[PDB]
Each structure stands twice: as C-alpha cells, then as structure tokens.
C-alpha cells in the first residue's frame, strides 16, 4: 500500500540531490550551506559543529529510535523472540555482514580504507529493500518481508554497535557521566512504570546532547530510548506500539527522505570520471561496489548452510536468495555508515564511496528485482 510510496519519494530525493549538487546554479548554495559552522548554545554550554553533522546526528538519531523500537518488539514479541524464530535471520545476517566485509576488507587490507571496509557494504537500506519488494503485487511476501527486515536491522544496528566499540570513545568525562545518569533515569523511569512516552523522549534528547561529540553515539541514543520506552500492553494499550506507529510515516516520508537530500547529492561532474575510472579505482569503490552485489553470495552460503536444523518459515524456497540480493542496496544506510567512516576524517574519497555504494546499489536493485518478478 504505502510501504513503497516512500521508496519512490526517497529516490526522488536522491535525484533532486544530484541535480542540486552538480547544477552549478545551486551546486554553490547547496555545498555552501551544507557545510557551514553552526554553534548552538543553551545557556552555558556551547556546541559548535557543521550543518550536515547536526542534521545527521539529528536525523539518524530519530531514525534509529524507531529502529530501536522495532528491534525490541521483534525481540520481545514477534519475528525474533524465540531462539527458534531467530536462529535463521541471525545466522542469515551474521553472515550478511561478514562476507561483504571479508570481501571488501580483504579487497583493501591497505591503509586509510581498512576502517572503511569494516562496514560500509554491511548496512542495507531497510527502507528501500522493502520498497522494491512492495512494487510486486502481494503474493509471496507477508513472511518474506517480515524476514528481510530482520537482517537490515541486525546488520545495520549491528554495524553501528561494532563501530561504537571499535572507536576509542571520546569519553568526555562529564558527558560520559551525564549519559549515565540520563541512561539511568530511563531505567528507574521504566521500572516505576511510566508510560507517559513524552518523558522518555526528553531524557533521550538530554542523553543525545550528552554524547553529542561522537555521531555514532548520538545515533545510538535513539536506539537506547526506543529500547526503554514501555512495551507490555499491561496498561490496556502500549505506549511503544503507538509511538512506533506515529513515527513510521514521519521517518519514511520526512526524515529518511530529508536525510537523503543532504547526503546523496554526490558530485560526479567536474571529474565525470568515465566508466572504469570508477570500477578501476581501488576497493574504496570496486570493493564496496561489489561487496554489495557479491554480498548476496553470503546467505547463499550462510542462510543456505542452514541444512542442519533451521526452518525457512512458510517461505518460498530458493526464492529467499532473491532477498539476499536486495540486502545489497545499503543506499542511505551505507551512505550514512560511510560518513561515519570518513566524513570528519579524510573526506574527499567520501564522494567516491557515495558513488560506489550508489552504483553497486542500483546495480543490485534491479539485478535482483526482475529475477523476482518472473517467479510469479
């Protein structure tokens, strides 16, 4: 219905971006504002960081809040509560984020890219992956869809975490502390049984503001909240279930899209960089431009290597391998994980990663779409 009305209004953004980016008439204002200093200060605390940076810490924070919510749900209720319903998707994604890496990483065991591999081609645009799957009538899914979504999250929410530990936490003494009292309140707050979901959010923004010197952390705060916001329908209704529902449209229509308008505007012109000028380029491009379509050759080795005692789940047999093809469109999710990887560190080769994870992305969005149209 409206589960694919976003994938379109999303791609529209990406396009609108490029246009803006290479326009020459706008390529100026765009890149200009998108990287201006912006100091925000509330009373005595002064926070200074670049436009984009704020925007992303804000957007992916909200986005991952919703992700947090859902992963809790699936973990405590539906699609993943039992170590029986889990086993497959977990084994499916724990693969889904080690083959792409160990393909790209081993494609680039060189230097200021070693950090790049570790992820980038891991995240799958869980928003786009279900978008292209919806343009397909309605027969076959309803158990296939609720499956894909187990990877995307596990793989994405995975990376974000692996990356939070890999980093030498800028343990700003104070902040790290506030983050604790806040993260503590969140608990006592859930313990004493508070369902006034308004609170939880504000504490969160505090926690978020605290860990605000390391993106990946502010992002994680979202998740941390979506994790504490009450779930048991004990009340008579669930505060989380409600929130997750009002947020859904907004993220898929405003956020996700908006986020894509800020990061997908990759500049190709100037240096049109002909064909091989892209693939040719070290892994940074080919590596992650392939770590993605060749990131399917993982389930079909990890999800299939499950001929030991792990059921498909009223699936569609070999029609599962077409799913693992779509988890090759890390689109925005990667673009994000890419900014995390570079963005503030050597960021000129970031316009490359964008291209790579954009080519490899589309060239896996149809090379996986059609195959799954003739199936029915």
Overview of the structural elements:
The protein is mainly alpha-helical and 376 residues long. The protein has a single domain, classed as Na+/H+ antiporter like domain (Na+/H+ antiporter like fold, Up-down Bundle), CATH 1.20.1530.10. Helix content is 56%, strand content 3%. It has 18 helices and 2 strands. A two-stranded antiparallel sheet has the order 1-2. It starts with a helix and ends in a 14-residue tail after the last helix.
List the helices and strands and how they pair.
Elements: H1 5-22, H2 27-33, E1 37-42, E2 45-50, H3 51-76, H4 87-96, H5 101-104, H6 114-117, H7 126-134, H8 145-166, H9 173-191, H10 198-210, H11 215-228, H12 239-263, H13 276-279, H14 286-290, H15 299-302, H16 323-326, H17 331-341, H18 350-362
Antiparallel strand pairs: 1-2
């Amino acid at each position: 219905s409206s589960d694919a009305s976003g994938g379109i209004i999303l791609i529209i953004a990406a396009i609108l971006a490029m246009i803006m980016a290479n326009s020459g008439a706008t390529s100026g204002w765009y890149h200009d504002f998108l990287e201006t200093p912006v100091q925000l200060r509330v009373g005595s605390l002064e926070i200074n960081k670049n436009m984009l940076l704020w925007i992303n810490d804000a957007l992916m924070a909200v986005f991952f809040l919703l992700v947090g919510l859902e992963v809790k749900r699936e973990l405590m209720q539906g699609s993943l509560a039992s170590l029986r319903q889990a086993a497959f998707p977990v084994i499916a994604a724990i693969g889904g984020m080690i083959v792409p890496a160990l393909l790209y990483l081993a494609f680039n065991y060189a230097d200021p890219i070693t950090r790049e591999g570790w992820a980038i081609p891991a995240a799958t645009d869980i928003a786009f992956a279900l978008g292209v799957l919806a343009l397909l009538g309605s027969r076959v899914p309803l158990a296939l869809k609720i499956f894909l979504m187990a990877l995307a999250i596990i793989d994405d929410l995975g990376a974000i975490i692996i990356i939070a530990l890999f980093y030498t936490n800028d343990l700003s003494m104070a902040s790290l502390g506030v983050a604790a009292v806040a993260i503590a309140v969140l608990a006592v707050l859930n313990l004493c049984g508070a369902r006034r979901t308004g609170v939880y959010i504000l504490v969160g923004v505090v926690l978020w503001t605290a860990v605000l010197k390391s993106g990946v952390h502010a992002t994680l705060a979202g998740v941390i909240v979506g994790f504490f916001i009450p779930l048991k329908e004990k009340h008579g209704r669930s505060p989380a279930k409600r929130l997750e529902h009002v947020l859904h449209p907004w993220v898929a229509y405003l956020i996700l899209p908006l986020f894509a308008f800020a990061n997908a505007g990759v500049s190709l012109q100037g240096v049109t960089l002909d064909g091989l000028t892209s693939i040719l380029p070290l892994g940074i491009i080919a590596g992650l431009l392939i770590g993605k379509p060749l990131g399917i050759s993982l389930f079909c080795w990890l999800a299939l290597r499950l001929k030991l005692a792990h059921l498909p789940e009223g699936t569609t047999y070999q029609q599962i391998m077409v799913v693992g093809i779509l988890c090759g469109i890390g689109f925005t999710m990667s673009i994000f994980i890419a900014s995390l990887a570079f963005g503030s560190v050597d960021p000129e080769l970031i316009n490359w990663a964008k291209l790579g994870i954009l080519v490899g992305s589309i060239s896996s969005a149809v090379i996986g779409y059609s195959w799954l149209r003739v199936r029915l």
